[PDB]
Design a protein around this nucleic acid. Structure first.
Lengths: 234, 554, 178, 50, 151
RNA sequence: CGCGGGGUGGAGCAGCCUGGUAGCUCGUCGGGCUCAUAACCCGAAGGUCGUCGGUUCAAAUCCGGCCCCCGCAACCA
RNA sequence: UGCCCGGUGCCGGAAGGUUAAUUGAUGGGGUUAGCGCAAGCGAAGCUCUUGAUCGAAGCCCCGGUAAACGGCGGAACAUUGAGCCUUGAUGUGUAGGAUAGGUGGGAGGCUUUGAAGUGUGGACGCCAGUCUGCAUGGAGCCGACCUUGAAAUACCACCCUUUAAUGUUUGAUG
RNA sequence: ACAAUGGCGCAGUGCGUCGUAGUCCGGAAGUC
């Protein structure tokens, strides 16, 4: 793959390149180092100690964070039959009976959260092995298919985040936008950190954070010293 | 940590033979590419059977790193006779496929009116942790296409019809999807064709976390090949590098050592000889005579197996036309093996047979031996021609039988071809002294199980040899022995090889299995075929195709 | 099949009234007949005996008993318990069966034979003889056997004299045809 | 010489072994017999060898 | 003779095509003094090659003539009380004389049922460069290449 | 008397602690190269392993029992 | 005033083999915040043990020596490894030529020129591609790609490996 | 003599046979 291009080098030479700062300081830097592309979304790339090769820690799943993530909380449901029969009252956002994720190579990205069902997943989504070159197609790897579609949709609309570890222990997660209040951002950050403490490493050394890297859709990123239990965000 | 594997004072005592491994203390680190070398009986396959954990009846501590997955590839794989797809799916993705099938049942259950949603959602969590922990799976087209790119026989083919390299290449490709991090493997160079050896070289060379094998090829030792673990008195001596001049140095290190030990012993005997005349006896008569002789003066054992060598029975007298094939055609399903093949073999002729594993070489042998028939064309043998066949498949009745008994069949006197001789003396001409004869087939090295195999099938008389992969199981001193024996045999033989010198010995003619139904016959030494090949190459140079790039470089 | 009956009635009364006995149990009845081959097959070749075995088992309907050497011989190397040949003891049915086949067909086909030979007696009353070429039997041919052997025979009978055995032999039917 | 000393381990009873000798010169095979277990108080297959 | 040495003496033409390369070719192949039994199996060898292969009869001995033709050879030259093997370049006259001989010697040595058969084998393996005749030449090559040092 | 080594074809030796094949040099024999003789070339022959028997399935080998040749010692007085 | 360096003594050499103190890495064991009616699992810190890494003289080995003992037959600096970053470059086990590690962000740009094309030097036999110097050009390549595949490559984090450069830290020799 | 430049049969030649074998070879030996 292509690596660290001229555009990223030069943007980084204007404000800042490869260092850790306090959460208030980092985010301020990131916000103004943004270029455009499109109005600034923040995501966080969390390096922790993994026992994930042997699934002895839960760091591939998805949990609701107290504020609704991304810029629009965008939900699509691949489902069929007697599972979304019982989502009649609640309502799935979008039903794909087979075909609903296919917009990507036409220059079109679109979901915060893809909900999938047990009848659907065997058809569509069951090869989770490769999705390349991005991980958006619905997969076994973040897991937990629907017992009924109803509850799954309610959770996603409320503010559910799909996170995996990469390969070697970096857990990439959408926190929100930069327009969100320091206090509204703080909460999601704190929430992802307790989510990991619950799910501890069992013998990857006791580390729930190591190196925090932080990013937005276009600019250049920076790293945090600590983002969760320190004070404020802005 | 640096220790990917570590060994503390490891040994093995075999009181019939000698001590076969002793005081092995080594540390294996990331990035290292190690070939373990030595003769038959040097303990090199055993050292790898210890590190793989196969053999654990040892002194000392043989200990792996706690987070590595460790891959081991033996010389005769555990793949059952079952089909190619079924054995390829079996020990690799099964654990993930069972998790993906339970995960589909859980999908089906979400649409069932009586399923427990809370226990379904916990089973889904423990399934997705398995499928992610394993990571890979059977997949839509991957492994299946990868096996076809790496040119393995049919996905619906039987593992039991598959020859040395193919069956090993499947086993390896599988093994690698199962456990990657450290490789421990049992002479992987023998019985694997040109494109498969160039593949194995590339893979081992790029490898992570490390590689530990064995080889008998000078090309391996130059390309992969970072470190050399010499085994020979049962001690291990790691040496960093190198090239074929080290082998020459080793031969010179043993000739110096054997002669310096033989002089020290002789030097001691002159001093011992006078002693009677009128010493007091004192420390020499006890320390010299009782303690030094038999045990301490007995180091010369490994160097002595070099001059036991090996034997092939010569022919029954036989005429000028041995074998006549005209326009022979043979296929297996849809795969053309042989098409319009014609050759006649003259007396004193040694025919080399080349090409890939599974090209159809053994199926010719089977038509000559009448366990097959020509689909089209004809095979005519002379009338007095007697055949002696040597397979890839070298299996036998039991593993707890003696060397002598497996070869003799319970006879003191054997009729070897047209002539009677004592069996014990016949079994010894394959390098077997009375204590090596009394050992069992399960105990023996592959290289001893190789001489054992040849010693057995050669009793019917050496009139017409059909040898498939001779080099297979052999250690290098047994390889020198087969070569020396073959330099003294008269010929009437059709023989396979993959090994350049061995090819150079076995041609006075060539059958080159090139492609489906293309098998070429040429009459001459391998050097003659080589000059012909360089002439074809010449003309190939000017022609624009990216075929010729492989004959130029890798 | 055949000889069995010819023995009960005709043969038995003929012997009875030549020795003028009054008990019909004082008449010789054939007791057994042994088919030994022991031409050293298993001294230089274990499977040649297996062969040899099978060849006696073709004329008798069933596998044979593998024979063994009873002490150490230096001049032939062997030892006690060492295989060396094979027998088939015949009593009853198989006795009859063989006996028939033999006299009828085989005995004409013996080299230059044309009469009677009844001079070989143990002392008790028992008869033996050899077989040089095995192919003299109606079901053993050269276009059937892989290579030719001989074998030898031991006819035991409840005779108490060689007058007795000698008569028994002459009272059987040698027809000189195939 | 000395016919070797094995220590025959138990696997439904005791955690120990009974003690005996065997000829390894002619048996590369691992020994097993029924020997009596005082912990189970019943006879049982004993296994394991040198 | 050392004074009255002379070159080839008037070979009798090819009956069929008229080439005096073919004339020589036949000559060489004969034994016990019979051109008839020679030339008989020669035409038979040509026909079987031009048949199998499909080639003209012409190029079936002319591009066999090129690939069996040598370019250097090995002379065991005693030079006093000492002896050294040396190469020299084979004399043009001799150079394809040698060629045609060897194609007959190759088939005599290299087996098959009959001499026309054995020769319709070598006439292939000539022009392809692997033949028993090809070998001879790919042998006096190696052996003038090591001794290339001396001369 | 007391200790121990070695007896292998015609000569001089290997093998022998590992019992299943007797190997080497010279000479001899037969064939060649010389006019002839040495050298030289090709091929072959000659051995109960000093013996007698023993354990062993089997001894040149391991173990004993005789016939030999050579060494070591014969001392405190 | 000759012959012997195999022995014993010694001298000269260390490339390899074996090798001390040193150093204390890894594995193993003990304790128990805590998880659990629960059996039994066990973090951190502290210890009990094993002894990676380095490591010489000696010794094996290599070369000598008998007017040796004796024997003389049948603080700086240069070079150079390695631990961390920092800054780059391939990321090819099946198609797909391949630059599809993998996940989130995410559909339009400044990188004031960043076009791009034509050509030069190096890099990958993935040499289609891009990486990467310099001239013309102060200008937007590129995303149904072209193509296969269940998935297609805009564009920002960033993952570790094979590896490189700077910052170094450290261990060596000189 | 040892053989298909041939053997046998009706030097050479015409047919027909044998197909490389100790053979229809040679008159056991012998594969030039």
């Amino acid at each position: 793959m292509a690596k660290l291009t001229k555009r990223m080098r030069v943007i980084r030479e204007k404000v800042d390149a490869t260092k850790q700062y306090d959460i208030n300081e980092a985010i301020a830097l990131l916000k103004e180092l943004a270029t455009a592309k499109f109005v600034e979304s923040v995501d966080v790339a969390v390096n922790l100690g993994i026992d994930a090769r042997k699934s002895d820690q839960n760091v591939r799943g998805a949990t609701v964070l107290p504020h609704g993530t991304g810029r629009s909380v965008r939900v699509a449901v691949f489902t069929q039959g007697a599972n979304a029969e019982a989502a009649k009252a609640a309502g799935a956002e979008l039903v794909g009976m087979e075909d609903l994720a296919d917009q990507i190579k036409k220059g079109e990205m679109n979901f915060d959260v893809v909900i999938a069902s047990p009848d659907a997943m065997r058809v569509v989504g069951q090869l989770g092995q490769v999705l390349g070159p991005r991980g958006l197609m619905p997969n076994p790897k973040v897991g937990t298919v629907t017992p009924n579609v109803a509850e799954a949709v309610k959770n996603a609309k409320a503010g559910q985040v799909r996170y995996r570890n990469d390969k070697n222990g970096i857990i990439h997660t959408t926190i929100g936008k930069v327009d969100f209040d320091a206090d509204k951002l703080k909460e999601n950050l704190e929430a992802l950190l307790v989510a990991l403490k619950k799910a501890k490493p069992t013998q990857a050394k006791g580390v729930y954070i190591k190196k925090v890297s932080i990013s937005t859709t276009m600019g250049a990123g920076v790293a945090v010293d600590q983002a969760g239990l320190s004070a404020s965000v802005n | 940590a640096q220790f990917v594997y570590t060994m503390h004072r490891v040994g093995k005592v075999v009181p019939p033979k000698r001590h076969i491994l002793k005081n092995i203390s080594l540390s294996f680190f990331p990035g290292a590419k190690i070939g373990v070398l030595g003769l038959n009986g040097a303990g090199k396959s055993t050292l790898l059977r210890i590190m793989a954990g196969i053999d654990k009846d040892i002194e000392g501590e043989a200990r792996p790193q706690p987070d590595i997955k460790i891959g081991y590839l033996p010389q005769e794989p555990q793949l059952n006779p079952e089909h190619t797809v079924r054995e390829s799916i079996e020990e690799a993705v099964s654990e993930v496929v069972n998790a993906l099938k339970r995960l589909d049942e859980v999908y089906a259950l979400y649409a069932d009116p009586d399923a427990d949603f809370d226990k379904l959602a916990a089973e889904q969590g423990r399934l997705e942790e398995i499928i992610q922990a394993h990571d890979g799976h059977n997949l839509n087209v991957q492994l299946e296409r990868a096996a076809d790119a790496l040119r393995l026989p049919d996905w619906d083919a039987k593992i039991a019809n598959l020859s040395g390299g193919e069956r090993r290449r499947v086993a390896l490709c599988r093994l690698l999807l199962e456990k990657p991090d450290m490789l421990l493997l049992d002479e992987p160079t023998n019985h694997l064709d040109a494109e498969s050896v160039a593949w194995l070289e590339r893979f081992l060379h790029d490898f992570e976390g490390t590689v530990v094998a064995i080889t008998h090829d000078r090309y391996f030792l130059d390309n992969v090949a970072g470190w050399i673990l010499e085994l020979d008195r049962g001690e291990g001596i790691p040496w960093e590098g190198n090239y074929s001049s080290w082998l020459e140095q080793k031969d010179q290190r043993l000739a110096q050592e054997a002669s310096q030990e033989a002089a020290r012993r002789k030097s001691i005997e002159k001093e011992l000889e006078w002693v009677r005349q009128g010493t007091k006896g004192r420390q020499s008569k006890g320390k010299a005579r009782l303690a030094r002789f038999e045990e301490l003066n007995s180091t010369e054992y490994q160097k002595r197996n070099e001059t036991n060598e090996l034997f092939i029975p010569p022919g029954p007298r036989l005429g000028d036309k041995v074998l006549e094939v005209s326009n022979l055609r043979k296929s297996y399903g849809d795969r053309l093996l042989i098409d319009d093949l014609s050759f006649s073999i003259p007396k004193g002729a040694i025919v080399g047979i080349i090409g890939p594993n599974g090209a159809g070489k053994s199926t010719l042998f089977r038509m000559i031996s009448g366990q097959e028939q020509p689909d089209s064309g004809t095979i005519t043998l002379g009338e007095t021609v007697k055949l002696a066949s040597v397979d890839q498949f070298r299996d036998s009745m039991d593993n707890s039988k003696t060397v002598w008994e497996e070869v003799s069949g319970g006879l003191d006197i054997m009729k070897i071809g047209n002539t009677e001789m004592p069996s014990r003396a016949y079994v010894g001409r394959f390098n077997f002294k009375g204590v090596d004869q009394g050992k069992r087939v399960g105990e023996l090295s592959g290289g001893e199980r190789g001489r054992l195999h040849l010693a057995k099938l050669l009793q019917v008389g050496g009139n017409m040899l059909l040898l498939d992969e001779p080099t297979n199981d052999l250690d290098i001193e047994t390889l020198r022995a087969l070569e020396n024996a073959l330099l003294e045999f008269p010929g009437c033989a059709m023989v396979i090889s993959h090994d350049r010198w061995f090819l150079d010995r076995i041609a006075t003619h060539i059958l080159d299995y090139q492609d489906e139904g293309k098998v070429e016959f040429f009459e001459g030494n391998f050097t003659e075929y080589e000059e012909y090949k360089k002439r074809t190459l010449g003309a190939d140079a000017l022609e624009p195709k990216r075929i010729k790039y492989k004959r130029i470089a890798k | 099949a055949k000889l069995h009956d010819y023995y009960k009635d005709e043969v038995v009364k003929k012997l009875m009234t030549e020795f003028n006995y009054n008990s019909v149990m004082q008449v010789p009845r054939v007791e057994k007949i042994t088919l030994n081959m022991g031409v050293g097959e298993a001294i230089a070749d274990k499977k040649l005996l297996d062969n040899a075995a099978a060849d006696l088992a073709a004329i008798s309907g069933q596998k044979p008993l593998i024979t063994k050497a009873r002490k150490s011989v230096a001049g032939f190397k062997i030892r006690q318990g060492y295989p060396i040949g094979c027998k088939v003891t015949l009593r009853g049915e198989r006795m009859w069966e063989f006996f028939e086949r033999l006299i009828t067909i085989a005995v004409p086909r013996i080299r230059d034979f044309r009469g009677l030979s009844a001079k070989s007696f143990d002392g008790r009353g028992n008869y033996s003889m050899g077989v040089r070429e095995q192919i003299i039997f109606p079901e053993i041919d050269y276009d059937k056997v892989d290579r030719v052997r001989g074998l030898d025979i031991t006819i035991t009978t409840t005779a108490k004299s060689d007058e007795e055995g000698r008569a028994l032999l002459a009272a059987f039917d040698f027809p000189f045809r195939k | 010489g000395i016919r070797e000393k094995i220590k025959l381990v138990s696997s439904a009873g005791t955690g120990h072994f009974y003690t005996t000798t065997k000829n390894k010169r002619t048996k590369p095979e691992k020994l097993e017999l029924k020997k009596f277990d005082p912990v189970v108080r019943q006879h049982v297959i004993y296994k394991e060898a040198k | 003779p050392r004074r009255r040495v002379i070159g080839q003496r008037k070979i009798l033409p090819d009956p069929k095509f008229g080439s005096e390369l073919l004339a020589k070719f036949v000559n060489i192949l004969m034994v016990d003094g019979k051109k008839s039994t020679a030339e008989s199996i020669v035409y038979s060898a040509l026909e079987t090659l031009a048949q199998r292969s499909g080639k003209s009869e012409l190029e079936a001995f002319e591009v066999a003539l090129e690939n069996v033709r040598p370019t250097v050879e090995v002379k065991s030259r005693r030079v006093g009380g000492s002896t050294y093997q040396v190469p020299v370049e084979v004399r043009p006259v001799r150079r394809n004389a040698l060629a045609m001989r060897w194609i007959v010697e190759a088939a005599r040595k290299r087996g098959d049922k009959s001499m026309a058969l054995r020769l319709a084998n070598e006439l292939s393996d000539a022009a392809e460069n692997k033949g028993t005749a090809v070998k001879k030449r790919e042998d006096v090559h190696r052996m003038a290449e090591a001794n290339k040092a001396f001369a």
